[model samples]
Target: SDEEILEKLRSIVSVGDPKKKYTRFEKIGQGTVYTAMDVATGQEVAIRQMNLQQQPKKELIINEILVMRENKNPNIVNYLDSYLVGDELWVVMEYLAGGSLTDVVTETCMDEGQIAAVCRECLQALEFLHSNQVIHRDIKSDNILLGMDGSVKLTDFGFCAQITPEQSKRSTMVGTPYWMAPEVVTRKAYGPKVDIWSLGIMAIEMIEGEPPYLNENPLRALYLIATNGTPELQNPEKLSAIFRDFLNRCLDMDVEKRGSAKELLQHQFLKIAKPLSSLTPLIAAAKEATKN
Candidate 1:
């Protein structure tokens, strides 16, 4: 009965209309502001726009969809429809009913195998994105999506960039500063390797149930990530030793030393679990998502 009550509460969110109404999608996310719409046969979609009444980051949003559309890994969220609506832009995709990885992660400590699945899914998606010269500069728990079909689709490309071969590195410091790599924070040349660092932070965050750096002042955490020493895993014993090692390689002070997504895929941690392929195909069952 409690579960039913909670479901009713969650389903009771007010979805807005793009034409005139601006009702908010109250359930999907907490911090970021986003509108909601149900189009194309009345399937609900959470519409996240960077800034309201501002010219939407149209190209960037489309680029993100293009990246995923080409390599629509079952784990990644699919792009259903996108277009500029008035001054703002709208992207409608499969709405994940299970909520975010941030919530799923906190509900339980995943066994090493389960953790590996999540890691593999994110790593695989990142691999595809990087190969195409795109960088998901912001990678964190809140940004990660956990769908009802049991897939981990990396979302929120707010700090994302399309890298050209000529420009090997970007000097821009963008992203959730908590996950920002040292070089990114200090305003030096940074690139895909920074994702490695963020993924490492994510792994630690998944395992520790808390962020590595928690200072008296929230901004101080950025200083620690930028200039301070290695992120201290709160307790090593609670997590698999290999998992800690992955974090160590991710948060490596020397950017050159951080592990790559390809390498992380081969770690002993991954060896402990079967790939997502091992799971029964839930495509047909994933709410709001197509089977194909």
Candidate 2:
């Protein structure tokens, strides 16, 4: 049966060693990500290589590849191909030269307008995912990638989960400790609303420069998330009423009350969002800082 499953997986992935088709140049993300060139097309692409032997479960790897293969949206990173080489799984994707939102947020200060624009793009991606019964359980600045042209895309579907009509809720506790939703931290059955909570935490990080409880231990942070109702902004008065209201809708303790991606898109705070191109300067600044 395992052999049959491997055969089925092989059918979905490309048939060959990824090294022959692509030339890896620079290592990023501490060996997880590589900037590679397509030998035939000469186009640069991002390659994610995972050690199958080190992975805890094979099913999550299969799920990530399958989910990425089925979804194609402008706000989501494009999955070009995949390969199984020895014990490593190589995934190819469009290279986002501008780097991740973590870089921008760390190197520069984002005003409300820029933060709202980033939120709009991420929400659009989430809208599509949620509509397809998929949940991007990990929603953080690190997973949001930016292109040189200011295009924002969601990547890293390692923790993504799919919901079916028969099993609408997931009880598994997953995601970064700082961004975990209350329901997820408490190990309760949760659905797509969990993503909204993480996005809300990410919004706070964009504004406050980090998530709440950044100094706390992991276990302590999880306990705080489960017990603390809604996290308050560091300086509530600094944010506009509309922006605060939007965050409120997203960070609501009650999953039923939290705003879905589709609903959050209609929030008044998004009215202040500028065009995606407006983020170009920030991305450039971040890249410049990295060079120094």
Candidate 3:
């Protein structure tokens, strides 16, 4: 079924236009995401805009749209349509009111249980992506969005890649420096495990309000990540033992020793994590703070 999804995705190349149909709103990333009234169904939708002029940006947009097309997971953003408007391309997605996880983590103090809920959703999304031979090259708080109802969905697929048995390892050295895997920083051949390492960094981010080496320069962070290996949380003793172990699995220095998305899904930390709905307070707090 998903293989067919890939095929449908392959057919999509260069994507178009409802000018008056959309009531434009917030800006997300390089694109200005808006709220639109789906003319055909008479329903509301979220729209994202991007520029199309060159080689990789255009290609990345195509791939991002493709990944969105095949994905139907609740923890992943939904895709509906794409259009070419002048030199800019607009992508339609499901509206998520709570904004990005970065929005929340920067504003609120999240308990371990709340962080676990977010992680569980993300890991599920990652598991789905990895199962379909895709690697989400970018995994960070800024890329993780939330819904008012406490739904955690992964977004920003511009750097995502689809893998195959014939070519399983990626050599691309892309992604935010702070959350990057050691293998990625070293330019070593890497696979889905790379995301796990970033997830570990993300876990630390949730607790510490930032990834390690925030004060250091970007080049310095990259160098440290490459040489110093896996990082420990600021105060590991502050969190539960299960969560600490989960982070350990994700931050394992050897890629082979790292846990897979599917394996990590079963981690004991997730089992005891509070329900997703419990994150509502944190989301509300973030929204409240943003109003000020």
Candidate 4:
């Protein structure tokens, strides 16, 4: 699902000249957003906007900003500013220049340390988002950004939402259909556990360069994902055992059996500190959106 970000990025529209106050509308990673180039200040800023392809639920983006503003994960994108206009809302943020992890490399990479580092950082961010009861419905290599300092920033919270026990039972069928969890396909009870499934698919993509059931024909890919189990890693020999365990926990068929983001942090593979800071009060952030 995130694979198309690069080709889409080729269409980035650099709006005004460098030395002017303007916005460069473009595709950075998976989501289509804009960079507010403040020429006088020589700064490039990110503005989360409504994509024409998928007009996000405005309340959803608002909730994302409120929750993410305080979460300081090196792998999670943070907020710079957020406000609303006549009919649209905006979230001003940091513009990460480096491209997606997919564009940089592919296929059971030979570099174990870098792979582990990426995994560690992403797991941390996922823990943060999920701990706050938010699910990053869209997550993949293309949505994972590598900063200048070699930090990972989990991105594209447009499809995300706060979860509740009752809310988990009625599914509306959103997100990249291929990366959907089994229960998502069946329209059964789903929640943050669905995000775990997407993360597991991401792990497979991380190790194999492409999605397991990839096909030029998107609908067939859907059938493969729905009917068949996960496919093989492109280079099975090179993947680590710890990485495999992480995937197992994420890809479980039973949503009830899935581990929480906090529990996943303790999986030894994530290399998280035992006493992690809480990214709680997700409902508080949701409350703000409700008010707006």
CA lDDT, candidate 4, residue 165: 62
lDDT of 4 by residue, 1-292 (tens): 2224322322232322222344555544344467666555556777755442354343455445556765657677766654433233445667765555665445224244555566667778887777766777777777887664566688777677777665644466667866777776755657776767777777676566577666647667766766664445666666567766777787776677766666776777655322111211221232233332
lDDT of 2 by residue, 46-117 (tens): 998887667666777788889999998999999999987766778899898998898998888999998999
Per-candidate TM vs. native? 0.75, 0.94, 0.89, 0.70
Best candidate (score: lDDT): 2
**Which portions of model 4 miss their true places by more than 4 Å?**
1-43, 48-73, 83-90, 106-110, 165-170, 271-292
Q: lDDT of all predictions, in order shown? A: 0.65, 0.89, 0.81, 0.60
* Steric clash pairs (candidate 2): none
lDDT of 2 at 18: 83
Assess candidate 2 and give its lDDT.
Answer: 0.89
TM-score of 4: 0.70
Supply the global lDDT for candidate 3: 0.81
Model 1, residue pairs in steric clash: none
List the candidate 1 regions with Cα displacement exceeding 4 Å. Answer: 1-44, 49-52, 55-72, 274-292
Window of ten residues with lowest summed lDDT in model 3: 1-10
